[PDB]
Design a protein around this ligand. Structure first.
Ligand code: NI
Ligand code: NI
Lengths: 157, 157
């Protein structure tokens, strides 16, 4: 029988990147929450928050096959990035882990949003691309704040 | 005969990102070739070059199922980024497009390099993650140079 479900594969793929995101987030102290590489860039706190919430929305939508969920506003009082990070990483992990293998084949009607329909797997690949994209930026932020010992962009696990 | 048009799917996936990379590269004039967001960061030219060459090596290696190709040094006189970009984007596109669907299942012995064996498809996903990762950084560079009208990080359709 299969050693792992699709869900389990996606979760490992997710974590191989999100773990790095979290390592980077821990290098950001309150003093740099509002750091910006450029005058028109997001603050570090904005960037990190956007990554956590946006991915949660992708997973949430994917899990429930419901496109309306996608732009549902997340209101969270947490304030402390690191705690926020661990909270939403766990919520996101659990959503994905709870999916069946057919769920990944379900078609999502996203014309209203991406102007197109899409398999749940393509949709999740988009969420990954989005996370990897922003993590790349986060790398630049963190070096800008002066940190030089940075993790590999992706974890061997 | 390739029932899944794997190559063709990968190519479309590749281009949906590489096209944005190229749009960004065109916003970089010779005057900013050596721009760096931080004193310890790669220059814009170094970053863009690294993306073009690294991906070419992934594809090259994938196409020929030959791990030795991977760290083969690329020597290129071009100098002009944009031309370099279009040249290597086309070479990369052609390599991937010329692959059969079984090629994507071939196992690559990469212990010497990543300390692990890997399917060609996982290997190509790594190449994509790497491109997306660096394109994220390139976005920070380009805003830093002063450009504010930036493409979406990925082109759909
Ligand atoms: Ni975003
Ligand atoms: Ni790299």
């Amino acid at each position: 029988s299969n050693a792992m479900s699709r869900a389990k594969k996606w979760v490992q793929y997710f974590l191989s990147h999100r773990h790095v995101t979290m390592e980077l987030i821990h290098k950001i102290d309150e003093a740099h929450y509002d750091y910006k590489p450029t005058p028109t860039s997001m603050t570090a706190k904005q960037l990190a928050t956007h990554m956590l919430f946006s991915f949660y929305n992708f997973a949430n939508t994917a899990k429930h096959g419901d496109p309306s969920l996608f732009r549902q506003k997340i209101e969270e009082p947490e304030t402390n990035l690191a705690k926020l990070a661990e909270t939403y990483t766990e919520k996101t992990r659990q959503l994905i882990e709870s999916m069946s293998d057919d769920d990944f084949d379900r078609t999502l009607d996203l014309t209203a949003i991406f102007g197109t329909q899409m398999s749940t797997a393509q949709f999740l690949q988009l969420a990954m691309d989005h996370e990897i994209h922003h993590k790349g930026q986060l790398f630049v932020y963190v070096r800008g704040m002066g940190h030089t010992d940075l993790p590999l962009f992706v974890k061997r696990g």
